[PDB]
Amino acid sequence: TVPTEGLEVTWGNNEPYKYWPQMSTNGTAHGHPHEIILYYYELYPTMTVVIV
Amino acid sequence: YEHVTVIPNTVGVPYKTLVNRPGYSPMVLEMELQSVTLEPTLSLDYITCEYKTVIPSPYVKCCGTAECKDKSLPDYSCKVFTGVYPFMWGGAYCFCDAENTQLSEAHVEKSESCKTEFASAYRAHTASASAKLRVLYQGNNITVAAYANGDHAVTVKDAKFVVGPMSSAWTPFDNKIVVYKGDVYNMDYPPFGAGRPGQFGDIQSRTPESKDVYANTQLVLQRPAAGTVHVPYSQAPSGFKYWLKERGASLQHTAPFGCQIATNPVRAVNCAVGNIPISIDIPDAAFTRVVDAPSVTDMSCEVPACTHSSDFGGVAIIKYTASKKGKCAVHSMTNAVTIREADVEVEGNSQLQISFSTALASAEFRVQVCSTQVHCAAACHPPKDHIVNYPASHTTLGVQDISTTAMSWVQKITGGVGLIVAVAALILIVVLCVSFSRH
Amino acid sequence: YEHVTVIPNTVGVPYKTLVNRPGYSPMVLEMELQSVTLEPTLSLDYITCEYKTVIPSPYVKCCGTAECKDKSLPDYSCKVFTGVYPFMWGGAYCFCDAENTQLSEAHVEKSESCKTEFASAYRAHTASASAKLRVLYQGNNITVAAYANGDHAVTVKDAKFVVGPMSSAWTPFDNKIVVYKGDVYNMDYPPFGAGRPGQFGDIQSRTPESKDVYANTQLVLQRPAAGTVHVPYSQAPSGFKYWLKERGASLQHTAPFGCQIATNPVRAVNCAVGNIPISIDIPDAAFTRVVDAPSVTDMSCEVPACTHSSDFGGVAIIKYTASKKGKCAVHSMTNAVTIREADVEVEGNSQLQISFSTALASAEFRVQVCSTQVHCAAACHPPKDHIVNYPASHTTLGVQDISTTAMSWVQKITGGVGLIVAVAALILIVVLCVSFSRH
Numbered sequence: 001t002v003p004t005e006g007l008e009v010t011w012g013n014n015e016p017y018k019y020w021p022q023m024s025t026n027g028t029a030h031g032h033p034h035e036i037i038l039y040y041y042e043l044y045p046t047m048t049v050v051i052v
Numbered sequence: 053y054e055h056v057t058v059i060p061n062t063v064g065v066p067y068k069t070l071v072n073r074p075g076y077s078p079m080v081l082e083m084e085l086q087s088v089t090l091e092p093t094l095s096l097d098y099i100t101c102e103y104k105t106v107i108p109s110p111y112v113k114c115c116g117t118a119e120c121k122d123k124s125l126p127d128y129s130c131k132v133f134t135g136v137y138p139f140m141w142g143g144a145y146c147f148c149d150a151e152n153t154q155l156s157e158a159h160v161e162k163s164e165s166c167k168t169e170f171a172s173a174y175r176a177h178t179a180s181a182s183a184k185l186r187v188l189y190q191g192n193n194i195t196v197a198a199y200a201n202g203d204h205a206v207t208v209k210d211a212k213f214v215v216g217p218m219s220s221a222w223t224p225f226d227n228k229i230v231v232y233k234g235d236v237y238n239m240d241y242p243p244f245g246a247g248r249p250g251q252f253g254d255i256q257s258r259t260p261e262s263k264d265v266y267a268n269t270q271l272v273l274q275r276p277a278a279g280t281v282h283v284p285y286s287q288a289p290s291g292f293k294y295w296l297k298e299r300g301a302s303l304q305h306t307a308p309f310g311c312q313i314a315t316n317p318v319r320a321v322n323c324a325v326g327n328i329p330i331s332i333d334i335p336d337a338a339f340t341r342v343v344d345a346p347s348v349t350d351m352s353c354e355v356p357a358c359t360h361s362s363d364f365g366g367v368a369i370i371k372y373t374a375s376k377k378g379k380c381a382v383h384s385m386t387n388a389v390t391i392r393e394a395d396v397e398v399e400g401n402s403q404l405q406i407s408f409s410t411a412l413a414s415a416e417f418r419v420q421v422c423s424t425q426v427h428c429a430a431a432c433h434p435p436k437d438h439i440v441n442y443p444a445s446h447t448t449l450g451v452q453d454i455s456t457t458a459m460s461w462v463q464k465i466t467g468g469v470g471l472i473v474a475v476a477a478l479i480l481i482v483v484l485c486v487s488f489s490r491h
Numbered sequence: 492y493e494h495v496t497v498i499p500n501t502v503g504v505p506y507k508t509l510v511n512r513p514g515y516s517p518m519v520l521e522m523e524l525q526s527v528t529l530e531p532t533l534s535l536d537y538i539t540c541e542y543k544t545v546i547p548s549p550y551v552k553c554c555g556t557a558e559c560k561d562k563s564l565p566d567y568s569c570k571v572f573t574g575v576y577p578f579m580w581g582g583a584y585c586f587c588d589a590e591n592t593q594l595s596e597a598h599v600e601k602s603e604s605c606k607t608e609f610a611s612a613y614r615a616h617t618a619s620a621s622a623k624l625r626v627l628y629q630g631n632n633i634t635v636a637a638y639a640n641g642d643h644a645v646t647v648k649d650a651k652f653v654v655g656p657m658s659s660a661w662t663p664f665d666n667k668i669v670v671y672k673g674d675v676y677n678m679d680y681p682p683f684g685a686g687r688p689g690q691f692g693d694i695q696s697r698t699p700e701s702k703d704v705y706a707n708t709q710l711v712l713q714r715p716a717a718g719t720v721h722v723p724y725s726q727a728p729s730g731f732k733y734w735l736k737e738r739g740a741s742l743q744h745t746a747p748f749g750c751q752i753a754t755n756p757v758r759a760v761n762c763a764v765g766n767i768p769i770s771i772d773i774p775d776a777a778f779t780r781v782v783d784a785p786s787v788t789d790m791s792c793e794v795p796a797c798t799h800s801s802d803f804g805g806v807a808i809i810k811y812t813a814s815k816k817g818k819c820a821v822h823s824m825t826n827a828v829t830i831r832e833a834d835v836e837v838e839g840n841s842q843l844q845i846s847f848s849t850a851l852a853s854a855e856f857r858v859q860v861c862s863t864q865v866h867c868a869a870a871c872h873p874p875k876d877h878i879v880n881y882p883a884s885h886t887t888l889g890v891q892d893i894s895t896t897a898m899s900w901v902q903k904i905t906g907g908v909g910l911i912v913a914v915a916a917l918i919l920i921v922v923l924c925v926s927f928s929r930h
């Protein structure tokens with residue numbers, strides 16, 4: 001799993017690798033109300049439930 | 053003119069600042085960090101290595117009794133045995149069939165190879181810091197190098213820079229460390245003069261050239277077998293060899309915040325904590341008056357594409373009308389949007405093109421070009437790739453950043469509910485007033 | 492067998508402790524402190540010394556105009572003057588009666604004498620500690636030397652000693668110090684690259700062998716006088732010379748707690764703060780069994796003189812009966828009285844004499860000699876001299892220490908007043924009972 005801050009991986013005698021995450025979703029921020037909520041749920045899961 | 057700014061402690065991300073002085077045209081500088089180094093102060097305690105055992109020839113004395121005396125050598129031992137009858141290749145050694153004795157002795161020294169294979173124990177104290185920068189200054193790249201505290205000043209091309217101090221005192225080293233051929237460990241080594249028979253620290257010395265040695269290995273002599281000449285003994289094996297086979301992982305592979313470790317001299321490089329303030333003094337000959345710079349009178353904005361990825365995923369087009377040929381600066385007036393270009397060339401009646409990156413779902417921002425402002429707005433789409441190999445180039449979002457369509461829905465629901473409360477309360481007030489008067 | 496004690500940090504006063512182990516005779520030890528040293532960690536910043544000015548021959552060009560170019564040397568200057576007319580010992584130099592010109596230049600360097608006369612700036616960090624002790628052991632004197640922390644052990648005559656850590660972290664040095672030929676001052680020197688034209692630090696360098704020099708003195712050239720060939724100038728005088736005439740008193744004469752200071756290396760000696768714990772281990776071969784020690788059966792005490800001065804001003808005489816000849820220890824069982832002797836010799840039926848010191852006005856204490864107790868008492872007179880040249884060898888007194896005569900008067904007065912209140916209270920209770928019952 002790749003956290004927010006990143007991951008570092010070392011394999012044998014080679015140099016280490018670095019990975020960072022990027023935004024993606026299947027919802028949309030424009031359109032019907034039920035599609036808007038899915039957009040923010042998949043990006044900030046814990047804060048969406050509390051506020052709503 | 054004096055200017056002060058603050059820069060976060062991240063390597064590989066450029067930053068920009070604005071200089072504004074009344075009566076003159078504005079100026080924009082670009083700064084980027086390349087390396088930060090920390091270095092502690094060290095003191096030596098003692099060193100360790102492998103050992104050697106010395107056994108001289110036995111003494112077989114026949115038809116008599118022998119004795120031995122005491123000495124001052126480390127781990128000295130003596131014993132006398134009775135009832136021996138040794139043999140050799142041609143027959144028995146001595147005539148008597150009893151009343152024979154044997155004497156044996158041994159002691160411990162320091163091996164010769166301690167001048168190549170050894171480990172060193174240190175004591176650590178507070179560390180210093182250093183830094184190195186690249187600055188874009190009047191169309192050229194210059195480099196500066198200075199200590200990260202307020203007691204150093206450097207001058208390059210008639211400009212003076214002062215950097216530091218840092219905002220945090222975090223360090224990855226403890227009070228006690230151990231070093232061996234490029235690896236650094238955190239360990240609580242035993243006190244000098246208090247070693248143990250089978251662990252790290254059975255042999256101790258103060259310097260590879262010194263003559264004093266402390267040893268705490270067990271050594272007991274045992275009885276010779278019948279018909280043989282030899283000197284057997286029992287002893288705990290070396291502790292330095294055992295440590296090499298089970299020492300575990302080093303500090304480079306376990307340290308937090310992504311620091312790197314080197315040993316000659318001991319350093320830690322590129323730790324991402326805190327932020328660094330910077331101060332710069334600019335002379336008067338570097339400025340340009342307002343009347344000599346060109347003026348721009350009519351503007352409009354259009355945004356044909358936007359995608360809020362971690363790279364520069366935007367493009368914009370601006371139209372302008374200029375008075376005469378010259379140079380100008382470009383700067384953004386909002387914190388959530390970054391613009392790559394620093395300056396442009398304007399002439400006649402034409403257009404110019406720029407690029408930007410942002411994290412907003414709905415983009416609204418203002419752009420300033422030589423003392424005038426314009427308004428841009430567009431809608432943005434999300435990307436398709438999940439994982440990339442470089443950090444973001446824009447800042448994070450707050451609670452107030454919400455798409456325009458979502459903000460509209462909140463207003464209708466909130467406003468409508470408030471009306472039902474408002475109308476109900478007026479009924480209560482009127483009905484209470486009539487009852488008060490009627491009585 | 493382990494034993495722990497605590498001694499105050501004062502030099503030149505002996506102390507005694509008691510070791511008591513069941514099955515063996517008691518043994519008394521004595522210890523005395525001879526030196527304590529503190530030493531910080533230093534790092535160098537820069538040095539300062541005098542400067543020198545270099546001026547070459549002037550250039551006179553007649554019937555023409557001259558010009559000059561720029562150079563990178565420190566404090567460079569060039570100027571051009573018009574309308575000159577020089578003279579020499581034989582007559583005028585050049586034919587033309589006007590349109591002559593003169594060129595002059597100068598720059599600043601570093602003097603050669605800087606390798607012998609210079610001052611140095613440092614930064615200071617946490618310090619270490621060391622100590623030296625004298626112990627009376629088994630009827631002989633021995634010396635030990637060790638670091639004052641829990642990370643060192645020494646062995647003398649089969650006994651281990653551990654000294655430290657200290658109870659206070661007070662140090663007389665600040666973060667910045669300046670050193671010059673045996674003197675140390677506390678000073679806040681200006682940063683590197685930010686000197687002043689007439690104070691300490693106008694010229695700076697990183698090491699006595701460096702080639703890079705920074706200078707911020709003022710240098711202005713002036714017009715030559717009529718008929719002469721010379722190069723006048725104006726410049727602020729040296730700042731390092733002024734400091735030597737106005738530096739004031741050093742730390743050795745101003746430091747608190749009575750510390751001493753030496754500079755090669757920088758150390759502080761004999762500062763009186765805190766106390767030091769000590770741990771000692773004694774082998775089993777050093778004790779004597781109780782069956783072998785002599786016994787004492789009858790005891791008495793008589794004291795012929797007492798004056799409670801800062802020296803040993805008491806004498807006592809004790810009678811005894813002993814079973815057989817041998818050695819014995821003496822020890823006091825009160826804290827307000829100290830006894831000088833550690834061991835005594837006993838035989839037959841005789842008497843022995845001791846001396847003591849105390850600050851009490853009325854004396855009452857006990858003495859132990861080989862597992863027996865005796866009681867002594869006396870009255871003491873005050874001394875007649877006002878001032879001495881050595882500290883006291885006894886402890887201070889508390890509020891419960893009062894002369895026997897004074898205690899009697901307080902008891903009588905408090906008892907007498909208390910009786911009146913007691914008799915009054917009984918009368919009131921009897922009356923109150925009759926009123927309650929009768930109604």
Ligand SMILES: *[C@@H]1O[C@H](CO)[C@@H](O)[C@H](O)[C@H]1NC(C)=O
Pocket residue numbers: 024025026042
């Ligand atoms: C979105 O839909 C695609 C459809 O193939 C699916 O693979 C993916 O797991 C879904 N979720 C996200 C976050 O992309």
Ligand SMILES: *[C@@H]1O[C@H](CO)[C@@H](O)[C@H](O)[C@H]1NC(C)=O
Pocket residue numbers: 167168233
């Ligand atoms: C090379 O050998 C010398 C002694 O001959 C030793 O001091 C040094 O540490 C060795 N080099 C390394 C990298 O161990």
Ligand SMILES: *[C@@H]1O[C@H](CO)[C@@H](O)[C@H](O)[C@H]1NC(C)=O
Pocket residue numbers: 191192193
């Ligand atoms: C040097 O300046 C040029 C602009 O003239 C810039 O494109 C380049 O990135 C600079 N060099 C580095 C190493 O950034």
Ligand SMILES: *[C@@H]1O[C@H](CO)[C@@H](O)[C@H](O)[C@H]1NC(C)=O
Pocket residue numbers: 606607
């Ligand atoms: C003695 O002179 C040398 C240079 O010749 C100098 O380094 C040293 O500090 C001087 N020592 C004293 C005590 O003056």
Ligand SMILES: *[C@@H]1O[C@H](CO)[C@@H](O)[C@H](O)[C@H]1NC(C)=O
Pocket residue numbers: 630631632
């Ligand atoms: C050394 O020991 C003797 C007794 O043997 C004692 O009298 C003397 O005071 C000791 N030395 C010092 C400096 O006290």
